[PDB]
Design a protein around this nucleic acid. Structure first.
Ligand SMILES: [Ca+2]
Ligand SMILES: [Ca+2]
Length: 258
DNA sequence: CTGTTGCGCTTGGA
DNA sequence: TCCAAGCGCAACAG
């Protein structure tokens, strides 16, 4: 099951287990957290698979002062634990300034990454997490360090796609007939009896990607932005104390019965 | 509109 | 199992 299906299974669970007081937000919506408890004390619940990533921030190398600068276009403010990650990479500037796709691990105490995550998700009014070990686990942001091991790497992450627009429709068809694919287009919708799912087409300084949806084909334009970001990874601890499990469930049931 | 960027998401290949 | 890596989305500037 993919991560989209997993979010749906968590919302479905909460609604049947506790009542339909849980609203699911957009899947790939960067602005907010996953599930909004629409009760008398609203808060957010964050869904994460057993192996997930856990937030990020962009750092721009500044080769003049040989330090890393927090990008002003970031969406989360600096907390103390951010500055401690920056200071480490800055004092190791020579090795971290050569940005990589495979990334370079940050070998800092796990204490730092856990506190950054707690601060970051508190900043989104997340009070509880939900995940699964075969059975659904719900725990408050305060006890995060008892459920996940945390890793941290600094890597280039190319920015996301955008829909094919009218301006670049003459250019897309240019690249299509150079590859030999026959097609017809009703507006921006693509139609073909050849299967070109996830075919990548390129030419004249845009890169195109073809996707199949609703019995037809959608075209996406790929990005040109290759900034590096500190990014956190989490993995569910395999044997968890049943002592903390029951207390944290009681904490959730208390928080929604309020 | 058109293009850039940062955050969402584990995913896919070895 | 372990390691490498970017597209789907909204905000923002223009
Ligand atoms: Ca989300
Ligand atoms: Ca989530």
């Amino acid at each position: 099951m993919n991560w989209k299906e997993f979010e749906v299974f968590c919302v479905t669970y909460l609604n049947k287990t506790y009542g339909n007081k849980f609203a699911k937000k957009g899947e790939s919506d960067s602005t907010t957290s996953d599930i909004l408890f629409t009760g008398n004390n609203p808060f957010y619940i964050e869904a994460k698979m057993p192996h997930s990533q856990c937030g990020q921030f962009v750092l721009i190398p500044n080769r003049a002062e040989y330090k890393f600068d927090y990008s002003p276009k970031n969406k989360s403010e600096i907390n103390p634990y951010t500055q401690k990650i920056m200071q480490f990479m800055s004092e190791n500037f020579s090795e971290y300034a050569n940005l990589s796709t495979k990334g370079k691990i940050i070998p800092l105490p796990e204490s730092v990454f856990v506190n950054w995550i707690k601060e970051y998700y508190k900043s989104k009014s997340v009070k509880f997490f939900i995940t699964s070990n075969g059975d659904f686990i719900i725990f408050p942001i305060e006890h995060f360090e008892h459920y996940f091991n945390v890793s941290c790497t600094y890597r280039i992450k190319k920015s996301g796609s955008r829909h094919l627009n009218s301006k670049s429709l003459p250019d897309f068809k240019q690249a299509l007939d150079k590859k030999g694919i026959s097609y017809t287009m009703r507006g921006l919708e693509l139609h073909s009896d050849e299967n070109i799912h996830d075919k990548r087409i390129s030419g004249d300084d845009k890169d195109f990607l073809i996707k199949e949806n609703n019995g037809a084909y959608h075209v996406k334009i790929l990005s040109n932005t290759f900034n590096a970001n500190v990014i956190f990874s989490i993995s569910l601890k395999n044997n968890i104390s049943l002592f903390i499990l029951n207390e944290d469930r009681k904490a959730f049931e208390a928080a929604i019965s309020l």
